[PDB]
Amino acid sequence: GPGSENFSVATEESTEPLSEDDFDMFYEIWEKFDPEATQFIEYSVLSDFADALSEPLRIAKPNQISLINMDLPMVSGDRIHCMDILFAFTKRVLGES
């Protein structure tokens, strides 16, 4: 066996504010607006989706002003992609401003 008891110089345990339960909750609520699993929704229902989540991924209604102030893309000029919505919603929690 090695010396100096602990024998290492580093660790592998990550440090972030989110958990697996946040992403599971996101995908559970996502299916209510994209039951076809296309990975897209319209901006006309993005505000209902934003209010359907649990905290912290929630943006409590009225939320249209918050969505307008995000750097959210569009894929068509009227729809948005699942991962890009997720990113814009977690950006607040992560403190990336």
UniProtKB/Swiss-Prot annotation:
Annotated effect of mutating residue 82 to S: In BRGDA1; decreased I(Na) density; shift of the steady-state inactivation towards negative potentials
PTM statement from Swiss-Prot or TrEMBL: Ubiquitinated by NEDD4L; which promotes its endocytosis. Does not seem to be ubiquitinated by NEDD4 or WWP2.
Phenotype upon changing residue 27 to C: In LQT3; also in a family associating LQT syndrome and atrial fibrillation; slows the onset of activation, but does not cause a marked negative shift in the voltage dependence of inactivation or affect the kinetics of the recovery from inactivation; increases the expression of sustained Na(+) channel activity and promotes entrance into an intermediate or slowly developing inactivated state
Subcellular location: Cell membrane; Cytoplasm, Perinuclear region; Cell membrane, Sarcolemma, T-tubule; Cell junction
Effect of residue 58 to H: In LQT3; sodium current characterized by slower decay and a 2- to 3-fold increase in late sodium current
Tissue: Found in jejunal circular smooth muscle cells (at protein level). Expressed in human atrial and ventricular cardiac muscle but not in adult skeletal muscle, brain, myometrium, liver, or spleen. Isoform 4 is expressed in brain.
Domain of life of the source: Eukaryota
Effect on the protein of changing residue 93 to I: In BRGDA1; uncertain significance
Domain comment (free text): The sequence contains 4 internal repeats, each with 5 hydrophobic segments (S1, S2, S3, S5, S6) and one positively charged segment (S4). Segments S4 are probably the voltage-sensors and are characterized by a series of positively charged amino acids at every third position. The IQ domain mediates association with calmodulin.
Record text on subunit structure and interactions: Cannot form the same regulatory interactions with beta subunits as other Navs do. Interacts with the PDZ domain of the syntrophin SNTA1, SNTB1 and SNTB2. Interacts with NEDD4, NEDD4L, WWP2 and GPD1L. Interacts with CALM. Interacts with FGF13; the interaction is direct and FGF13 may regulate SNC5A density at membranes and function. May also interact with FGF12 and FGF14. Interacts with TMEM233. Interacts with the spider Jingzhaotoxin-I (AC P83974, AC B1P1B7, AC B1P1B8). Interacts with ANK3. Interacts with PKP2 (via N-terminus).
Note: Na(+) channels in mammalian cardiac membrane have functional properties quite distinct from Na(+) channels in nerve and skeletal muscle.
General function of this protein: Pore-forming subunit of Nav1.5, a voltage-gated sodium (Nav) channel that directly mediates the depolarizing phase of action potentials in excitable membranes. Navs, also called VGSCs (voltage-gated sodium channels) or VDSCs (voltage-dependent sodium channels), operate by switching between closed and open conformations depending on the voltage difference across the membrane. In the open conformation they allow Na(+) ions to selectively pass through the pore, along their electrochemical gradient.
Disease implication from the record: Progressive familial heart block 1A: A cardiac bundle branch disorder characterized by progressive alteration of cardiac conduction through the His-Purkinje system, with a pattern of a right bundle-branch block and/or left anterior hemiblock occurring individually or together. It leads to complete atrio-ventricular block causing syncope and sudden death. Long QT syndrome 3: A heart disorder characterized by a prolonged QT interval on the ECG and polymorphic ventricular arrhythmias. They cause syncope and sudden death in response to exercise or emotional stress, and can present with a sentinel event of sudden cardiac death in infancy.
Family: Belongs to the sodium channel (TC 1.A.1.10) family. Nav1.5/SCN5A subfamily.
Protein's recorded name: Sodium channel protein type 5 subunit alpha
Species of the source: Homo sapiens (Human)
